Design a protein around this motif. Structure first.
Motif, mmCIF file in Angstrom:
data_model
loop_
_atom_site.group_PDB
_atom_site.id
_atom_site.type_symbol
_atom_site.label_atom_id
_atom_site.label_comp_id
_atom_site.label_asym_id
_atom_site.label_seq_id
_atom_site.Cartn_x
_atom_site.Cartn_y
_atom_site.Cartn_z
ATOM 1 N N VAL A 149 28.644 50.175 -17.885
ATOM 2 C CA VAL A 149 28.696 50.564 -19.283
ATOM 3 C C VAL A 149 28.127 51.979 -19.361
ATOM 4 C CG1 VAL A 149 26.406 49.613 -19.764
ATOM 5 C CG2 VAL A 149 28.006 50.021 -21.644
ATOM 6 N N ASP A 150 28.824 52.848 -20.084
ATOM 7 C CA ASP A 150 28.411 54.235 -20.258
ATOM 8 C C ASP A 150 28.415 55.096 -18.998
ATOM 9 O OD1 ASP A 150 27.989 54.251 -23.086
ATOM 10 O OD2 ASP A 150 26.106 53.164 -22.781
ATOM 11 N N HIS A 151 29.334 54.824 -18.077
ATOM 12 C CA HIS A 151 29.434 55.645 -16.874
ATOM 13 C C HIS A 151 30.576 56.625 -17.093
ATOM 14 C CE1 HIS A 151 27.296 53.893 -13.055
ATOM 15 N NE2 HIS A 151 26.456 54.394 -13.942
ATOM 16 N N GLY A 152 31.423 56.318 -18.071
ATOM 17 C CA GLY A 152 32.536 57.193 -18.385
ATOM 18 C C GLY A 152 33.893 56.764 -17.863
ATOM 19 N N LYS A 153 34.125 55.458 -17.751
ATOM 20 C CA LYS A 153 35.416 54.970 -17.273
ATOM 21 C C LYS A 153 36.483 55.336 -18.297
ATOM 22 C CE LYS A 153 34.314 50.643 -17.176
ATOM 23 N NZ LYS A 153 33.002 50.851 -17.848
ATOM 24 N N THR A 154 36.145 55.149 -19.568
ATOM 25 C CA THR A 154 37.052 55.465 -20.664
ATOM 26 C C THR A 154 37.200 56.983 -20.738
ATOM 27 O OG1 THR A 154 36.089 53.577 -21.852
ATOM 28 C CG2 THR A 154 37.559 55.024 -23.095
ATOM 29 N N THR A 155 36.104 57.683 -20.461
ATOM 30 C CA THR A 155 36.091 59.140 -20.487
ATOM 31 C C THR A 155 36.943 59.693 -19.353
ATOM 32 O OG1 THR A 155 33.816 59.118 -21.349
ATOM 33 C CG2 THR A 155 34.640 61.203 -20.473
ATOM 34 N N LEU A 156 36.844 59.066 -18.184
ATOM 35 C CA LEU A 156 37.597 59.510 -17.020
ATOM 36 C C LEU A 156 39.088 59.228 -17.157
ATOM 37 C CD1 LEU A 156 37.609 60.765 -14.248
ATOM 38 C CD2 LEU A 156 37.151 58.502 -13.275
ATOM 39 N N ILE B 114 32.396 51.795 -27.241
ATOM 40 C CA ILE B 114 32.559 51.147 -25.944
ATOM 41 C C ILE B 114 33.951 50.538 -25.779
ATOM 42 C CG2 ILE B 114 30.120 50.598 -25.653
ATOM 43 C CD1 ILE B 114 30.716 47.818 -26.793
ATOM 44 N N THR B 115 34.355 50.331 -24.531
ATOM 45 C CA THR B 115 35.651 49.734 -24.236
ATOM 46 C C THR B 115 35.481 48.228 -24.060
ATOM 47 O OG1 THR B 115 36.658 51.672 -23.166
ATOM 48 C CG2 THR B 115 37.471 49.503 -22.498
ATOM 49 N N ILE B 116 36.146 47.450 -24.908
ATOM 50 C CA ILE B 116 36.064 45.997 -24.802
ATOM 51 C C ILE B 116 37.438 45.412 -24.481
ATOM 52 C CG2 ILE B 116 34.248 46.050 -26.545
ATOM 53 C CD1 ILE B 116 36.223 44.588 -28.437
ATOM 54 N N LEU C 133 32.272 60.089 -8.100
ATOM 55 C CA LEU C 133 30.901 60.473 -8.408
ATOM 56 C C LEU C 133 30.940 61.205 -9.744
ATOM 57 C CD1 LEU C 133 28.424 59.967 -6.574
ATOM 58 C CD2 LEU C 133 30.649 59.756 -5.437
ATOM 59 N N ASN C 134 30.866 60.432 -10.821
ATOM 60 C CA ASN C 134 30.922 60.977 -12.168
ATOM 61 C C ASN C 134 29.585 61.521 -12.664
ATOM 62 O OD1 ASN C 134 32.351 61.592 -14.549
ATOM 63 N ND2 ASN C 134 31.721 59.670 -15.520
ATOM 64 N N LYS C 135 29.651 62.290 -13.747
ATOM 65 C CA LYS C 135 28.481 62.886 -14.384
ATOM 66 C C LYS C 135 27.663 63.813 -13.487
ATOM 67 C CE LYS C 135 28.088 59.215 -17.797
ATOM 68 N NZ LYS C 135 27.158 58.507 -18.715
ATOM 69 N N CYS C 136 28.334 64.475 -12.548
ATOM 70 C CA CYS C 136 27.652 65.393 -11.640
ATOM 71 C C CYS C 136 27.347 66.730 -12.314
ATOM 72 C CB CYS C 136 28.497 65.628 -10.385
ATOM 73 S SG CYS C 136 28.594 64.210 -9.264
ATOM 74 N N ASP C 137 27.813 66.889 -13.549
ATOM 75 C CA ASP C 137 27.594 68.121 -14.297
ATOM 76 C C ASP C 137 26.139 68.313 -14.725
ATOM 77 O OD1 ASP C 137 28.729 65.802 -15.791
ATOM 78 O OD2 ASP C 137 28.096 66.970 -17.540
ATOM 79 N N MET C 138 25.435 67.218 -14.996
ATOM 80 C CA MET C 138 24.037 67.318 -15.410
ATOM 81 C C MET C 138 23.087 67.158 -14.226
ATOM 82 S SD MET C 138 24.196 63.715 -17.332
ATOM 83 C CE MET C 138 25.965 63.842 -17.273
ATOM 84 N N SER D 36 33.124 65.729 -13.293
ATOM 85 C CA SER D 36 32.580 65.551 -14.629
ATOM 86 C C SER D 36 33.743 65.112 -15.506
ATOM 87 C CB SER D 36 32.000 66.868 -15.150
ATOM 88 O OG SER D 36 31.634 66.758 -16.518
ATOM 89 N N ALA D 37 33.736 63.843 -15.900
ATOM 90 C CA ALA D 37 34.801 63.298 -16.732
ATOM 91 C C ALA D 37 34.836 63.938 -18.118
ATOM 92 C CB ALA D 37 34.637 61.785 -16.858
ATOM 93 N N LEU D 38 33.686 64.419 -18.583
ATOM 94 C CA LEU D 38 33.607 65.032 -19.903
ATOM 95 C C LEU D 38 34.136 66.466 -19.929
ATOM 96 C CD1 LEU D 38 32.734 63.971 -22.611
ATOM 97 C CD2 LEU D 38 30.508 65.071 -22.288
HETATM 98 N N1 GTP Z 1 28.190 65.108 -19.593
HETATM 99 C C1 GTP Z 1 28.993 64.120 -19.208
HETATM 100 N N2 GTP Z 1 29.129 62.993 -19.996
HETATM 101 C C2 GTP Z 1 29.959 61.990 -19.622
HETATM 102 C C3 GTP Z 1 30.678 62.080 -18.441
HETATM 103 N N3 GTP Z 1 31.411 60.956 -18.309
HETATM 104 C C4 GTP Z 1 31.169 60.165 -19.374
HETATM 105 N N4 GTP Z 1 30.277 60.788 -20.201
HETATM 106 C C5 GTP Z 1 29.743 60.265 -21.471
HETATM 107 O O1 GTP Z 1 29.418 58.898 -21.319
HETATM 108 C C6 GTP Z 1 29.901 58.125 -22.396
HETATM 109 C C7 GTP Z 1 30.511 56.867 -21.809
HETATM 110 O O2 GTP Z 1 31.327 56.194 -22.736
HETATM 111 P P1 GTP Z 1 32.521 55.366 -22.067
HETATM 112 O O3 GTP Z 1 33.550 56.343 -21.567
HETATM 113 O O4 GTP Z 1 33.103 54.349 -23.017
HETATM 114 O O5 GTP Z 1 31.741 54.642 -20.865
HETATM 115 P P2 GTP Z 1 32.378 53.451 -19.996
HETATM 116 O O6 GTP Z 1 32.059 53.733 -18.550
HETATM 117 O O7 GTP Z 1 33.864 53.324 -20.235
HETATM 118 O O8 GTP Z 1 31.595 52.118 -20.439
HETATM 119 P P3 GTP Z 1 32.352 50.893 -21.160
HETATM 120 O O9 GTP Z 1 32.891 51.356 -22.492
HETATM 121 O O10 GTP Z 1 31.365 49.773 -21.353
HETATM 122 O O11 GTP Z 1 33.486 50.384 -20.306
HETATM 123 C C8 GTP Z 1 30.953 58.952 -23.107
HETATM 124 O O12 GTP Z 1 30.728 58.945 -24.497
HETATM 125 C C9 GTP Z 1 30.809 60.355 -22.555
HETATM 126 O O13 GTP Z 1 30.415 61.241 -23.576
HETATM 127 C C10 GTP Z 1 30.547 63.207 -17.646
HETATM 128 O O14 GTP Z 1 31.180 63.289 -16.601
HETATM 129 N N5 GTP Z 1 29.706 64.230 -18.031
#
Ligand code: GTP
Ligand code: PHE
Lengths: 205, 85, 61, 82, 392
Positions: E20-27, E60-62, E134-139, E173-175
RNA sequence: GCCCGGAUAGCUCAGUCGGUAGAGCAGGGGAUUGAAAAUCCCCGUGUCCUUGGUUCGAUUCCGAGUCCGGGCACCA
RNA sequence: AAUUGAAGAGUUUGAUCAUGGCUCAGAUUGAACGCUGGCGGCAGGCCUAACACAUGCAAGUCGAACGGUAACAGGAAGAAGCUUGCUUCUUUGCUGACGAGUGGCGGACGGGUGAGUAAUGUCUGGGAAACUGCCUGAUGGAGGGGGAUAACUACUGGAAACGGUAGCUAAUACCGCAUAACGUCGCAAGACCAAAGAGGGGGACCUUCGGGCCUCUUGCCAUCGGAUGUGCCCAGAUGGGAUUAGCUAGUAGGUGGGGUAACGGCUCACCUAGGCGACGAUCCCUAGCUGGUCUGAGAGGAUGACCAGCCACACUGGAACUGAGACACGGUCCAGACUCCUACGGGAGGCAGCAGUGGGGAAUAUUGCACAAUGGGCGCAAGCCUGAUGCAGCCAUGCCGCGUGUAUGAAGAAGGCCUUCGGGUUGUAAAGUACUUUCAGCGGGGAGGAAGGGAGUAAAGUUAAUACCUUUGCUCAUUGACGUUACCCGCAGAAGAAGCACCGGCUAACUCCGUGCCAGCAGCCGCGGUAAUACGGAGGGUGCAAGCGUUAAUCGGAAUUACUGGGCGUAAAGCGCACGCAGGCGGUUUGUUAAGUCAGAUGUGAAAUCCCCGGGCUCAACCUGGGAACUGCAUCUGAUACUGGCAA
């Protein structure tokens, strides 16, 4: 549609013979007739009004094997015929092909005769008919298809033909397996032991 | 609606502008003849009548009037001129 | 009001059923039998005679 | 337009046409004026199969009846010679 | 609907697993936009994935949103799965369609038990290859600990018999890639590049008697109730009479619709992510948990034998060895069925970490097969990971 | 698929912020009688829905699941 | 040849005879449900929400009307490769044909639903104050000119929808002039009014070299017709309720104007003061009507699904235009509600058309194939459109036919059941054996629904013409959705196919075990209280059958609404009595009218369905020919006993 069960138990309930198992045996005798229609066959039946005319109606239906839905149909057809409704009914019930081929001797019994009918073994006027419900018209000729001829069964049935009374409103050949229908049955030319008087009265209620 | 028989829609619009315009001119001539009858001068009414005559005749022949109504307008109008004089 | 047919049932405050006609002459006011064999009102257990009524099927054995 | 058209009658797979004089603006098995006879394309070598009141056909064509070519073909097949 | 599916690229069915909150939806959103420059056909955003009110109520993604994109060498159909414990239901539905999953691992935290839980079911569902992201490597720019967190990812696959040292490490960095930072967008291109070199072509046996599990239930207006999923084996065409096996009686219906991504298709085959429309069936008659099959083939059974490997509390399972009578929920592809355990003689306390067997009898009649790999959960957490030993 | 309420002996509810579960309406077993009303003589029959956890100990603490009822959605 | 047709039983009581309700036995239905379930032929399949609707399709067509041709395929000029005609290929409306546009025609038929409507409708029978495209018959004319616009270019508003400004051009589009009649108005004299050319071929002639000219098909305008369709009026008939008794004021009528295709309070102005009502007006509720279906001995009662005629409606309500015809389902304008798109200014839409979906409901079908056949629209035609129709899928919903086999088979078995434990019974039942193979399954042959159309050709006609064209024959290749058809043949093998309610009397068919006013049964009488023919099971038997029962609904029995065909002193039922209007009925004689009545004739009573005699699908269901019937109505001509009117 057929009784297809205890084909001889029917005669036990009515106390008299119905020719279901005439066969190659002269007199049955190993049927336990008149002493037991069933398990409580020694008990005397009450025989009420409705029942006695019902047993009279049911006796003729066990003769030709025709069911009620088709027998009710035969009644209305006899009803729309002019003259005597009760006498009309026996003319129709003797008009069925399986009954006619039975009169010819090609069929041992009516049950054995119906087998020849449905298996397209009978050809009348050069036209094979599979429906046992074919009401034969006057002045026509019936026969057997060559491939369905003398195939071990119709030959022995011809031997049973010499032990019958052989009706007078039709004629058979028995030399080349042929038969012809001369005229419609007369009330004075049938078995005479069967009653149709009460059958008219049962369907009138 | 989505049917290529929508042509009859815009055609009738084009047909009504024509028809309405020609029927209003026919009616104003009928109004013109009445005024003379309301005046009393038979000669003026006579002149008015003979000029609107070839007008209504040409309109019924063009399929605008059912020919009987056309006849009546010429009829009862003449019924006015004899009562007038 | 409605009569409950057969031996033993399982209705409890709900379980959608089906209603058919029939006076019983024993319970005044009751004029309807419950159609046993349909909907969430299961048929009776172990009845071999007249199973058309009480929704008992032909033995699977 | 008054026409002397047909009318499908009979059973499924077993057609039977009924030559009839009717208004062209009516249904196939709808209202008409009067029948002329019948058409049996699924007939045999019995003795019949077609009976067309050729006189009644002529009594309407003088009034303005337009015969359909299938029926006119039957008029040609009821041949005026024999 | 329109646009019949063209088979010009080798079609592959992939998906994502993580936390949860790793950015799967973001990626998944970032994946399509990067692919949008080489082929503008997806260009999917975050809201295109999370389309539910509750999904936008908590960000969140449900629910499993489906998306597809194709490389100049292949075709991929990605699945975005939910990342919660109480949402593991829709997670396994997305996991069942995976010929290969992708791990969205944030290098900031790394291996969370919930992330391990995603690979655990993956091994139990049959995922052969997983490409890590390897996500979120930007921070997290401390490259020293970037390798340190990368090392722990390598070993987690290793202790679960998977080549973590062979797995393609893809940073990113998915964002920032979603907005347009070309450096991180190149990471997605590296993601796409490694996607075409680490994923083989799975064999789909279409000559086998037709079988098709139930993934999700829909009710398209004017068409009735349609059901989706992935055909295990066999093939189907429009007008093919089939039957469905569920937790209750067998029902009959005929195929009247074969679609993929809201686009038409003439014939359905094994492995493809398609769907079939039943003939005149109500939403009440069909619910998640049943399975389509070929007419006159499978009768629902009620008992089978099964081996299993129990997790520990520090692994995600239990810390207390149980006894007979304990009834957790047996999970297999589309169910949350609870059943009673009939353990073999000799063991009274199943300690967390056992690789023992058991004979299972469920409360619901269902269609099953020998050798089926599944998992067991209880109380909101995964307790078992077994294999169907033998059906009875 | 998610969010809650009822799941308590035949039935309806109380009892909890851990301590070996109650009442009422019942109904039933015996003596009298052709059989009963009545009268006299005695009364709990409970899986607290199922299963596990924090356990000297859970109805009550945390939840999963199933059943029923009530709201949101999602739309190949 | 054409209605040969009418049944009763149980329950009041101690017992009986009446009276009198209640109940069942029958047939039926657009059926639902429970259980079971082989095939086939023919029909039917949303009765509630006239509730809301995604998507596809349901009405287009004509170049033999015109300007044009954006595309497709040729011709032709040319152009580049380069095998110098082998290819590539920029133009050209010059052809075959053809998106978009003008115009003609259709879209008012076909199809669906039954909400509204109790009489403006429908039905029966008449009537005059009418109209009538296309089709067809008769007689004439068909002469000569002009002015615009869409398409198409330029520019441009708006997201889209959807236009705007300025110019180009034709016609069977529009507007004149000429000519007018047995046509229109008027008593008449007189006045006034119509139109359109294209298509094919061809000799002389003629050729501003477009073409004229000749001729044939078709078309245009007027008038009288015919047929068909449509509008309008009258009389009678067409539901329940009187606990609805007065209602109506453009209302009853007249006069004049206007209006309608046509008559009229249809609508207005003036005047008169009336009109309807117990043989039932208004009002309230319900309902589409009829032909018919079912039931019944008939008379009647009930009902109005499918098939067929008629009326009404099209999301709700309203109005009008076009047009021969709508005051309009796949048309227009407005208002309202409900959905939808949105660039938030502004717009899109109506499945009670085939399918299909959510939802309602006990319950009612595939987002199928084809225009081969019939019918319809346009076109000369070829053809094109065609969810009408022809067919198919699904459902035992109905009706009929067929199947699950026939023969033989006594130790008269095993097992089950009962028993006077003797035995009986299941029972020719099964096995064994001998034959057979329908329909399913599999494999080949193989009808018909097909009439025509197109190209070629001969002949007879029209004509200057052996041409064009039209008609009648002939020839070749053919047009089949259903369709792996109907049907026939062959092969394997008793092989793949029997259930459902009932058994106390009613009403055909029984005992035992088990439960003991408990459980349950039930249409009625009613059963069960420890020996149950009525509860449950088991065996046997009965009825019926791919269906058997249950429930709902209709008539019958019910002569318990009695016209045919009932009763009233005591059973329900004589007003307390009497007068008397309307109404009903009425002694006897003669004449007369001939209404009622009766006879005959005429028109009509649509078809189909019902009845009779025949024919064809192997028979039947079903389809179909002729006839009869349609028991009713109106007119005419007679009969005069009987009833009625007038007069003594
Ligand atoms: N700075 C930064 N933020 C990120 C990155 N990837 C994801 N995020 C943030 O993390 C949040 C994750 O939300 P989701 O994308 O729904 O996370 P999830 O992994 O799909 O988790 P679930 O919804 O439970 O499946 C997002 O709102 C993004 O803003 C990244 O690579 N860099
Ligand atoms: C339908 O499009 C499937 N092929 C993919 C899918 C999309 C959304 C939800 C479920 C399945």
């Amino acid at each position: 549609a057929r009784y297809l069960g205890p084909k001889l138990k029917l005669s036990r309930r009515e106390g008299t013979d119905l020719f279901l198992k005439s066969g190659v045996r002269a007199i049955d005798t190993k049927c336990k007739i008149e002493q037991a229609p069933g398990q409580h066959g020694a008990r005397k039946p009450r025989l009420s009004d409705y029942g006695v005319q019902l047993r009279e109606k049911q006796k003729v239906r066990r003769i030709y094997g025709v069911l009620e839905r088709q027998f009710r149909n035969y009644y209305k057809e006899a009803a729309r015929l002019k003259g005597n409704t009760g006498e009309n009914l026996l003319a129709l019930l003797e008009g069925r092909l399986d009954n006619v081929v039975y009169r010819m001797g090609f069929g041992a019994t009516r049950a054995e005769a119906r087998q020849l009918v449905s298996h397209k073994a009978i050809m009348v006027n050069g036209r094979v008919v599979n429906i046992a419900s074919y009401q034969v018209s006057p002045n026509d000729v019936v026969s057997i298809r060559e491939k369905a001829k003398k195939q071990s069964r119709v030959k022995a049935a011809l031997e049973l033909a010499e032990q019958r009374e052989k009706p007078t409103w039709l004629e058979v050949d028995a030399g080349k397996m042929e038969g012809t229908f001369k005229r419609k049955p007369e009330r004075s030319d049938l078995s005479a032991d069967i009653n149709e008087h009460l059958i008219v009265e049962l369907y009138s209620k | 609606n989505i049917k290529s028989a929508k042509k009859r829609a815009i055609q009738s619009e084009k047909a009504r502008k024509h028809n309405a315009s020609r029927r209003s001119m026919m009616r104003t001539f009928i109004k013109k003849v009445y005024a003379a009858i309301e005046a009393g001068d038979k000669a003026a009414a006579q002149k008015a009548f003979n000029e609107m005559q070839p007008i209504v005749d040409r309109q019924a022949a063009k399929g605008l009037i059912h020919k009987n109504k056309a006849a009546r307008h010429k009829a009862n109008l003449t019924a006015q001129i004899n009562k007038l004089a | 009001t409605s009569y409950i047919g057969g031996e033993g049932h399982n209705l409890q405050e709900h379980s959608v059923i089906l209603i058919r006609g029939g006076r019983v002459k024993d319970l005044p006011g009751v004029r309807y039998h419950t159609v046993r064999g349909a909907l969430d009102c299961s048929g009776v257990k172990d009845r071999k005679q007249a199973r058309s009524k009480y929704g008992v099927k032909r033995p699977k054995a | 337009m008054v026409t002397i058209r047909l009318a499908r009658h009979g059973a499924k797979k077993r057609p039977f046409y009924q030559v009839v004089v009717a208004d062209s603006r009516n249904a196939r098995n709808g209202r008409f004026i009067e029948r002329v006879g019948f058409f049996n394309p699924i007939a045999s070598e019995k003795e019949e199969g077609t009976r067309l009141d050729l006189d009644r056909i002529a009594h309407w064509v003088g009034q303005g009846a337009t015969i359909s070519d299938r029926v006119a073909a039957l008029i040609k097949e009821v041949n005026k010679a024999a | 609907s329109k646009e019949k599916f063209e088979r010009t690229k080798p079609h592959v069915n992939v998906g994502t697993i993580g936390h949860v909150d790793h950015g799967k939806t973001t990626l998944t959103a970032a994946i399509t936009t990067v692919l949008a420059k080489t082929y503008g056909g997806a260009a999917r955003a975050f809201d295109q994935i999370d389309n539910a009110p509750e999904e936008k109520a908590r960000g969140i993604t449900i629910n499993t949103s489906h998306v597809e994109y194709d490389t100049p060498t292949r075709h991929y159909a990605h699945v975005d799965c939910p990342g919660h414990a109480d949402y593991v239901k829709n997670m396994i539905t997305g996991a069942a369609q995976m010929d290969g999953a992708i791990l969205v691992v944030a290098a900031t935290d790394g291996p969370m038990p919930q992330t391990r839980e995603h690979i655990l079911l993956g091994r139990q569902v049959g995922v052969p290859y997983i490409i890590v992201f390897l996500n979120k490597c930007d921070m997290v720019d401390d490259e020293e600990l970037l390798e340190l967190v990368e090392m722990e990812v390598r070993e987690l696959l290793s202790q679960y018999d998977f080549p973590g040292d062979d797995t393609p490490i893809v940073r990113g960095s998915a964002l920032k890639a979603l907005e347009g930072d070309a450096e991180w967008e190149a990471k997605i291109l590296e993601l796409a590049g490694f996607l075409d070199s680490y994923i083989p072509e799975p064999e789909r046996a279409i000559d086998k008697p037709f079988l098709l599990p139930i993934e999700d239930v829909f009710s398209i207006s004017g068409r009735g109730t349609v059901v989706t999923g992935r055909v295990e084996r066999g093939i189907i065409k429009v007008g093919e009479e089939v039957e469905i096996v569920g937790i209750k009686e067998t029902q009959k219906s005929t195929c009247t619709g074969v679609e993929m991504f809201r686009k038409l298709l003439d014939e359905g085959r094994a492995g493809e992510n398609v769907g079939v429309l039943l003939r005149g069936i109500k939403r009440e008659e069909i619910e998640r948990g049943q399975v389509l099959a070929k007419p006159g083939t499978i009768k629902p059974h009620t008992k089978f034998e099964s081996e299993v490997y129990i997790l520990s509390k520090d692994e995600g399972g239990r810390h207390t060895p149980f006894f007979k009578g304990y009834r957790p929920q047996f999970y297999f592809r589309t169910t949350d069925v609870t059943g009673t355990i009939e353990l073999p003689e000799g063991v009274e306390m199943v300690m967390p970490g056992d690789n023992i067997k058991m004979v299972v009898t469920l409360i619901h009649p269902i269609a099953m097969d020998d050798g089926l790999r599944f998992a067991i959960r209880e109380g909101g957490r995964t307790v078992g990971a077994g294999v169907v030993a033998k059906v009875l």
